[PDB]
Write a protein that binds this ligand. Sequence first.
Ligand SMILES: Cc1cc2nc3c(=O)[nH]c(=O)nc-3n(C[C@H](O)[C@H](O)[C@H](O)COP(=O)(O)OP(=O)(O)OC[C@H]3O[C@@H](n4cnc5c(N)ncnc54)[C@H](O)[C@@H]3O)c2cc1C
Ligand SMILES: NC(=O)c1ccc[n+]([C@@H]2O[C@H](COP(=O)([O-])OP(=O)(O)OC[C@H]3O[C@@H](n4cnc5c(N)ncnc54)[C@H](O)[C@@H]3O)[C@@H](O)[C@H]2O)c1
Ligand SMILES: O=C(O)[C@@H]1CCCO1
Ligand SMILES: [Mg+2]
Length: 1207
Amino acid sequence: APAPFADFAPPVRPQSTLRRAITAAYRRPETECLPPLVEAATQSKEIRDAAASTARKLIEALRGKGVEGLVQEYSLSSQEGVALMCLAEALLRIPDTATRDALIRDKIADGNWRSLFVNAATWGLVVTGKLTSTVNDRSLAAALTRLISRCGEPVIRRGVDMAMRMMGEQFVTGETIREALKRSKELEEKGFSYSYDMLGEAATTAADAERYYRDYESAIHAIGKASAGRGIYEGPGISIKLSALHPRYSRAQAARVMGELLPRVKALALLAKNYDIGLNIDAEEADRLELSLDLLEVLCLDGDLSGWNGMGFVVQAYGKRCPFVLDFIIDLARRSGRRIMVRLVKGAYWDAEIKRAQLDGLADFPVFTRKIHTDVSYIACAAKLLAATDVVFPQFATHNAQTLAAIYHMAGKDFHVGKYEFQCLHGMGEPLYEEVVGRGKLDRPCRIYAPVGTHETLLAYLVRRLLENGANSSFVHRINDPKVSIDELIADPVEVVRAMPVVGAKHDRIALPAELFGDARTNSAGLDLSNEETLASLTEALRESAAMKWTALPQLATGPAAGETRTVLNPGDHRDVVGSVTETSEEDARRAVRLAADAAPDWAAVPPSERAACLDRAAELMQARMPTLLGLIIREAGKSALNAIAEVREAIDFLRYYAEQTRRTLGPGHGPLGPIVCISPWNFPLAIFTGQIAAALVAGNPVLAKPAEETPLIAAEGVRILREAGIPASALQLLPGDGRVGAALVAAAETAGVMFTGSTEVARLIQAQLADRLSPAGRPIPLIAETGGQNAMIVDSSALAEQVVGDVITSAFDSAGQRCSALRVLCLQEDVADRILTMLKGALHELHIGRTDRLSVDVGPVITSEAKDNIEKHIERMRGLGRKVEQIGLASETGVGTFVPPTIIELEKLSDLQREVFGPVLHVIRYRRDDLDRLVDDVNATGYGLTFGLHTRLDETIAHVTSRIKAGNLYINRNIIGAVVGVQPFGGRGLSGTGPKAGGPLYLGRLVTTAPVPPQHSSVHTDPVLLDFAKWLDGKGARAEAEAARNAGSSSALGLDLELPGPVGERNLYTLHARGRILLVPATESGLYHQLAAALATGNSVAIDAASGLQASLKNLPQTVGLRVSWSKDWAADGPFAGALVEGDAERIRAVNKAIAALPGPLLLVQAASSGEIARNPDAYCLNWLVEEVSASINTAAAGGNASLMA
Ligand SMILES: Cc1cc2nc3c(=O)[nH]c(=O)nc-3n(C[C@H](O)[C@H](O)[C@H](O)COP(=O)(O)OP(=O)(O)OC[C@H]3O[C@@H](n4cnc5c(N)ncnc54)[C@H](O)[C@@H]3O)c2cc1C
Ligand SMILES: NC(=O)c1ccc[n+]([C@@H]2O[C@H](COP(=O)([O-])OP(=O)(O)OC[C@H]3O[C@@H](n4cnc5c(N)ncnc54)[C@H](O)[C@@H]3O)[C@@H](O)[C@H]2O)c1
Ligand SMILES: O=C(O)[C@@H]1CCCO1
Ligand SMILES: [Mg+2]
C-alpha cells in the first residue's frame, strides 16, 4: 500500500536556480515588476529622438496608403453587412461554382433564402470592429431579407466575391500548405521570409492529436522541399502548438507529457533538422509556460538533434516571468551550444488570463494589466536579447511602429542576416513591414507568420486576431482612429511609465481576484497547482495531514460523549485508514437537543455583528488551514486536489457571505427559531455542512450538526474550527452517525427547524415526520430541503464542439459525477450528434481514475460499495435493454477501493431514466431542431429542476429555452457545476428543492421568526392579475381585503432582476419568478381573499380546496383572475404544486399539513396562519416564500474574447 501523497506531484526535474527565479515571478505584484523593466528599457536621449522620427516616418507612410466599400456602395446597415457576409460564407461552402451561381440567381436573389449566422460574431468583428458573445439571429434574418429584397443578385455577388477574397487570401495565406507556399513567392522576392502554422490547437482526443501531428509532419516535408537548402534564416520555417499534439497537455499530466508528447515533438524536430528549417514552439496559456520549458530543455540537450539551430521558442512580454524565462533560455543555449531562435511577442491570451486568475482566486495575475506595462516589458526584454545575439537569434514580432522603431535603433548600425529579424502576422503587418524590408527602406528582414487551413479549422485563431484588431489599446486599431494623433502614437512607453505617480500600478478597473466583491467581503483564495513552489509546499502539507490522528466524536454542550467507534477508510483504497468516528446514541442525540434548547436564549443574546465576527474568524482559520483541510477531504471523500480546493473555498465563501448578509439585515425583531437540526450529505462534506450550520448559527439559532455517516472527520474539523472562532460549545454540537441519528434529532420535541441537503427520498421521510409537528405557536416547523437533480444540457448545431466536450466531461465526470449539479442527460441536435459523441468518447478515454492522492488523477472513487453496486446495476440494466454503453477501462490498482468507470449511455427517450443516478454516468439523447420545445417539455417532465445547461450562439434559442425551462440554476455556454456563493446562488425547484437558495439573499430570512428585508430585495413591477383581483374585491365591497391586495402587490419582489458582481467574461443574473400553482386551503372567506392576494401578487396560479365550501365567495371573477384559479377536490390529482397556504386553528393546520405531505412529488413549502393572525398581521403569509429564485450564469467570453476588456 503506497504511502499517502508520497507521489503527489514530483517535478519533471530538480528546479535549477534559473528555473526557481522564473517561478518566483509568476504572480509578482505589478509595482515590483516594472522598475527593473523601466531601467532595462531606458535608452539615450539621442536614440529616443531618433526612434520617434523613425516611428513618425513609418506611421505617416502607413496612414498615407473592401468590406467598408461594400457597405458604402449598397448603403448597408451594420447588421445587413454582417448578414450578407454570413450568406456569402454559406454560399462558398457550395463547391460547384455553377451550382452556387444558379442558386444565387434563381433562388436566393428571388426571395426566400444549421443557422446561416453561426459565425456572425466573427463577421460582426470584421464589419463593426465590435465583439458580441452571441448572435441576434432574428435581427440578422430580417436584415438579410431586407437587403436582398432591396438590392437583389448584385449585392449577393459582391458579398460572395468579398468573402472569397478575405477567407482565401486575407484570413489565411492558403487553404493548404502547397497553396500557401505558391503564394509566398511574391513577398519572398521582396525580402520577407515565412513561418507556416497548420491551424490547430487544444486537441480534445488522441485522434485529434494524431491529425495535428500528421498535418505538421506533412507541412515540414513541403516547407523543407521548398526551402531547398536556404537554411533557417533565409528560408521558411514552421510553427507548432504543443496543445495540438496531446489531449492532456498540462502540469497535472506532466508524466504523460514527457513520455508521450516529447517524442512527438522530437520526431518533428528531427525532420526539420534534416531539411534545415526553423521549427518554432508557439507560446500559449500562462499555466503551460514552465511545462513547455521542460520540453525545450530535453530537446536542446538531445544529441540526436545536434547540428541544427532551427529550434525556436516564443516568450510573451505581457508575462511577468518574461525576463527570467529569457535568462533561462539564454543559459540553455550556452549549455547546449544551440543558437535558440527566440520569438519575442507581447501575448495573445490576455483577456483569458484575467478571467482565469479571478475564477481561481489566485494571488495576482500572471500578466500585466496596463497595456503600457507590456510595452515596457517588451523593450526591456529586447535589450536583453540584443546583448546575446551570439548565442540566440532574436525575432521581434510586433505590428507597433513605435515598438519597432525603438528596437531598430536599439540594435544599432551593425547588421547581417542571421543577427536578428522582425516578424509579423499575415494580413496584418505587411503595410508596416513594406516600409522596413529592403535596401531602400530600413534593410531589416521580416518573417511572416502564415496560417494555413480551411475556414473550419480557422475560428479560434481568427477571433484572437479580430479582437486584437478592434481592441481600443491596439496599435493597429489606433493607427486607423482619426482621433489619435501621430504624437500620441510615437509616445515613448518607457518615459510615460517612468513619470507615473505609482510606477507599475495595477489597472484601476480590473479587480484582483481577492477583491471581486469589493467592500462586501473578501473572496476566498485558491491555490495554483501549476506553481512548483506551491506543489512542493502542498506535497509536504498533504503528507503531514495523512499523519494526523483524525477523529470525530459526539461533541455535546457538556463535553464529548461515548459511543460506538469505527475506522474511516479511504474510498479509493480501503487499506488507507483515515481516522476514527464515534457515533451518537439516540439517547445522546435527544439530550443534545435539550441542551441546545437550554442554551438558545444565551446564543440569541449575542448581537448579530458578533455572531458574524465568529463566522469571519472561522473563514480566516479555514483559509489558513486549507492545505491540511485539502489532505483530509482528498482521503476521506475521494476528492481530487482541484475538487478539494473548490470545497474549502466554498466553505470560506459561505462563512463570509452569511456574515455579511447578517450585518446587512438582522436586528432585534428578527428572533431566532430555536434549535435547528442541520443534516448534510457526504458529497460536499465541508462546504454544504459549513454553509447550513453557519447560516443557522449567525441567525441566532443553536445548531445540532449531523454530518453524513460517510464523511464525519472533515465535519468534526469544521466544528472544531467554528468553536475555535468563538462559537460556544452549547451553540454548536456535533452528532456523528447514520440516518437514525438524523431521525432522532428531527423527532426531538424542541427541534424548531430543519436544514436538510441530501436525496429527495430522505427529504420526503423528514417531511413526513414533521407533518404531525407544530411549534409552540402552533405553526409548521420550517424545513429547507435541497435535494437531487436530473440535470440536462441542450446543445444545438451552432455550438463549438470542443467547448461542449470540455464542459460535458467536467460537468458529468468531475468528482465521479457525485455532484448534485452534475450533468446527467446530454441532448444533442441530430445534425451534430455523431461528431460530438465521437469527440466525447475520445475525451472520456484520456481520464485518469484512481486514488486521489496524486495530482495526475482526474476522477476518484465512488463513496461506498453500496453506491458502486447501485450505480453498476443501473448501467447493466441499460446495457440489457440494448443501449450503447461506453466505459473507460480501469487500472488493476482500483481493486483496493470502490470505483465506477466514467460511462456514456446512449438513450432512445428521456423517459428511459427514472430517478437520479448519483455517479459517473452520462446519458445522451438526440433531437431534431423543430422538436426543441418538446424536448424542453421532456426535461421539465422529470419533475426535477436543479441545474440546466445550454450551448448555443443564437439569441433566439437562448430566449426560447431559458424562458421555458424550469430549473433553479441555468448556465449558458459553460459547465453546469458552478455554485459560487453570492454569484450563482444555488438551489432548485420541484423534486430538487424547497428553497430558499443557499448562498443567496433569502436564506437567512428562513431561519428567523420574522424575515428581514434582504439587500436589493424589491420590485417596481405589480402583477396585473393581482390588480384585477383587488378591483374585483372593491366591487364586491371587500374594501379592507382590496387594500391588503394592493399592499401585497407593492410588497412583492416578483420581477426582481439583478446582475451580481463576479469575474470578468461572465454575466451572473438573479431573478425572482412565480413558483407555479399554489395550493390554497382556506377556512374563511376573508382568509381566502388574503391567500389569493398573496399568491397572485407573486405571479402564481392557485388550486383552492373545494372542501372549504367557499365557492360562493368567488362569484363573477374577471376572466384574467379566473384563468389563474382552479378548484380541487382531489389535491393529489391536480398537482404538482409549488407551495401551499393554509388557514385554520392548530389542529386544522396539523391535519392539512399531514394531507399535504402525503401528496406525490415535490416537497411543498407550506405556510399556515389562523384567521386571527390573518386579521392582525399583514405578513401572516410571507411573500419571500411565494416567489422562485432563478440564477443564470452566461459565459460572455465564449466567442473567444472579452468585449468589455476590449474597450
Ligand atoms: C509573428 C507573430 C507571432 C506571434 N506568436 C505568438 C505566440 O506564440 N503566443 C502569443 O501569446 N502571442 C503571439 N504573438 C502576439 C499576439 O498574437 C499579438 O500579435 C501581439 O500581442 C500584438 O502586439 P503588438 O506589438 O503587435 O501590438 P500592440 O497594439 O502594441 O500591443 C497589443 C498587446 O498588448 C497586450 N495588452 C493589451 N491590453 C493589455 C493590458 N490592459 N494589459 C497588459 N497588456 C495588454 C496584449 O499582449 C496585446 O496583444 C505573435 C505575434 C506575431 C506578430
Ligand atoms: N440540492 C443540493 O444543493 C444538493 C447538494 C448536494 C447533494 N444533494 C443530493 O444529496 C444526495 C447525496 O448525498 P447523500 O448520499 O449523503 O444523501 P442522503 O439522502 O443519503 O443522506 C443525507 C443525510 O441525511 C441523513 N439521513 C438518512 N436517512 C435519514 C432519515 N431517515 N432521517 C434523517 N436523516 C437521514 C444521512 O445520514 C445524511 O446525513 C444526492 O441525491 C444529491 O443530489 C443535493
Ligand atoms: O495563435 C495565436 O493567436 C498567436 C499568434 C501567432 C501564434 O500565436
Ligand atoms: Mg445515504
